[PDB]
Ligand binder design. Structure first.
Ligand SMILES: CC(=O)N[C@@H]1[C@@H](O)[C@H](O[C@@H]2O[C@H](CO)[C@H](O)[C@H](O[C@H]3O[C@H](CO)[C@H](O)[C@H](O)[C@H]3O)[C@H]2O)[C@@H](CO)O[C@H]1O
Ligand SMILES: CC(=O)N[C@@H]1[C@@H](O)[C@H](O[C@@H]2O[C@H](CO)[C@H](O)[C@H](O[C@H]3O[C@H](CO)[C@H](O)[C@H](O)[C@H]3O)[C@H]2O)[C@@H](CO)O[C@H]1O
Ligand SMILES: CC(=O)N[C@@H]1[C@@H](O)[C@H](O[C@@H]2O[C@H](CO)[C@H](O)[C@H](O[C@H]3O[C@H](CO)[C@H](O)[C@H](O)[C@H]3O)[C@H]2O)[C@@H](CO)O[C@H]1O
Ligand SMILES: CC(=O)N[C@@H]1[C@@H](O)[C@H](O[C@@H]2O[C@H](CO)[C@H](O)[C@H](O[C@H]3O[C@H](CO)[C@H](O)[C@H](O)[C@H]3O)[C@H]2O)[C@@H](CO)O[C@H]1O
Lengths: 292, 292
């Protein structure tokens, strides 16, 4: 099954992604094919898939930017029916906004079927131009048709996945936990993570003993990421991944504070030095407290 | 012995405090008697006492605002010698900036003696007017003279004192620790703590599931306090007290995040709700992680 998560949805045949035109949160806003830059935040192309309680393999798809939902217009089974962004709710009973998502065929990409119409999300004619029409179209679960095949590029981790990554890291010991009970976390490309840091006021903040110390840079970074996420995205029910770790030597004579992020494959924790913007794998010693 | 700490130094005879004129960090800035508002931050009247390694009962006194030190002018033993703020260092060997601080007589207030001149810090003539001269003056360790008697109103806690207060609180369990190894923390009057919150952007920040959740308000408050301290004070080697606690129900079905502060007697932890600015004693349940 597709996991609950944030996905960048990329067409199997041509390198277009599912784009919400200009990220508008207006009802009736077209969802179109559009190019993307990998390992960046693609602002109008991020989709939060929420699983529907007791409908198997079926999700709402909320655009992160707009906070509006992928909507098959008036639920029509007609080939060429518009797919738009439309106001909604995560666990709606509106089938215009319910999508059964299952693997093709190739066993790797998915098909996206409207729960009501039973038609599939189609990049019409496999058109790779920017703003190319996306519509509901007749199709089958097992056919090879690339217009209806989409890679679900997982952009997020669950609390469980986050814990497991921290659990396999040699530098995080003692207590480590996420605040959110079963959260979904957008893992930022380092490019984006660095952007936030650059605009945070930390680069030009001076380290000062006790009064503006390592713990403060780490905290300040995490707040900057908190604020950025809230200000940048209209969707709710997800968080931005940014850990804080607080550590001490074997000798209680040196302390360290770091932020941490995740590799793009979501397997490994990487540390971030909020004073100068460095990424680090080996910081040894460890922490007594890590949260995200 | 006087403990290392931040003190508001109030004359025993009249209600004047040791004031650094206009908080200027200019060498030669007069230190004068001046009125104060209790349970507020008195901006020019806060003094960080640092103990001198291997000189008993002897401290530097650094004004928090200016980052300059109480200085007896050219070290003169002459009655009426000026006491000024002057650039320096915490563990300086300059006796103009070294002060032996010991209890009077009344067993409660202290006398402040220049280590070099052996004369005492004197509110000249017990003059309670604002801007009244403070000078070095002949005196004795045991005399009753109120001009040379000063209450050291402790404004701060050590890491040890902070731990002990958290240790006696029924709502803080699991891991709790301060980042700084033997830190000195200014405990804010709630009035000041509330001011920071009011100007932090939190009052008008909207709670949003996961993306701007309780952990984020708590973190954001702590960063606001971090920034306020750095921006407000020129002295180093001290921190502002503001804890963060992260908690969960017995049932893993409800989470809470709070900040915490200390009572003015430094004995008890009080929780702060960063969403709406509330102060709370009983939050039960507890935390799994608390830091400051
Ligand atoms: C209100 C308004 O008109 N704002 C404009 C933005 O919508 C527009 O942002 C672009 O929106 C499109 C389509 O909705 C794309 O999402 C685009 O990003 C994508 O294409 C880029 C090249 O066009 C690039 O490849 C990105 O990597 C990819 O995500 C997005 O920038 C901008 C710029 O066109 O103008 C705004 O004023
Ligand atoms: C035969 C016919 O045309 N039927 C109409 C329905 O399709 C229509 O339902 C609306 O369809 C739109 C576009 O597909 C949305 O799906 C809409 O649902 C969402 O928007 C509503 C506000 O516009 C509201 O916010 C809902 O909570 C949200 O789910 C859906 O109502 C209805 C209603 O217009 O009319 C039928 O005649
Ligand atoms: C650069 C400049 O001139 N700034 C002025 C401030 O210095 C001044 O701040 C006052 O400074 C005095 C003496 O240095 C006191 O510290 C004063 O605070 C104290 O007195 C207040 C009444 O005068 C009140 O009682 C406070 O509780 C007590 O701490 C402090 O405000 C201000 C205001 O005079 O003007 C600035 O422009
Ligand atoms: C007989 C006589 O007058 N002796 C002079 C000394 O008093 C004087 O020492 C200076 O005194 C000032 C005012 O008391 C300061 O105490 C000063 O120390 C601090 O300031 C220095 C810069 O001004 C420097 O920053 C030091 O590191 C710091 O401790 C102290 O030097 C000396 C030097 O002027 O001259 C003697 O003739």
């Amino acid at each position: 099954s597709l996991r609950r998560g944030i996905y960048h949805i990329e067409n199997a045949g041509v390198p277009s992604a599912i784009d919400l035109k200009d990220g508008s949160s207006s009802d009736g806003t077209p969802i179109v094919g559009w190019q993307f830059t990998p390992d960046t935040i693609n602002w109008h192309q991020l989709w939060l898939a929420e699983p529907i309680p007791n409908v198997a393999d079926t999700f709402t798809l909320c655009n992160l930017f707009s906070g509006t939902y992928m909507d098959l217009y008036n639920g029509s089974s007609e080939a060429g029916t518009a797919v738009n962004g439309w106001q909604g709710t995560a666990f709606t009973t509106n089938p215009h906004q319910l999508w059964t998502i299952k693997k093709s065929s190739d066993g790797t990409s998915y098909k996206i079927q409207n729960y009501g119409s039973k038609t599939f999300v189609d990049l019409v004619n496999g058109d790779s131009s920017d703003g190319a029409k996306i519509a509901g179209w007749t199709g089958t679960w097992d056919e090879g048709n690339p217009h209806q095949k989409w890679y679900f590029n997982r952009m997020s981790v669950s609390s469980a996945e986050a814990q497991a990554a921290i659990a396999r890291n040699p530098h995080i010991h003692g207590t480590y936990r996420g605040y959110i009970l079963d959260g979904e976390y957008l893992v930022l490309p380092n490019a984006t993570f660095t952007q936030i840091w650059k605009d945070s006021g930390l680069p030009g903040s001076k380290w000062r003993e006790q009064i503006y110390d390592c713990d403060d840079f780490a905290i300040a970074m995490k707040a900057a990421v908190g604020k950025w996420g809230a200000d940048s995205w209209k969707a709710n029910g997800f968080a931005i991944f940014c850990g804080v770790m607080l550590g001490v030597n074997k000798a209680g004579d040196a302390a360290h504070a770091y932020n941490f992020t995740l590799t793009k494959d979501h397997a490994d924790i990487v540390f971030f030095e909020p004073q100068n913007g460095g990424y680090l794998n080996d910081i040894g010693y460890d922490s007594y407290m890590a949260f995200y």
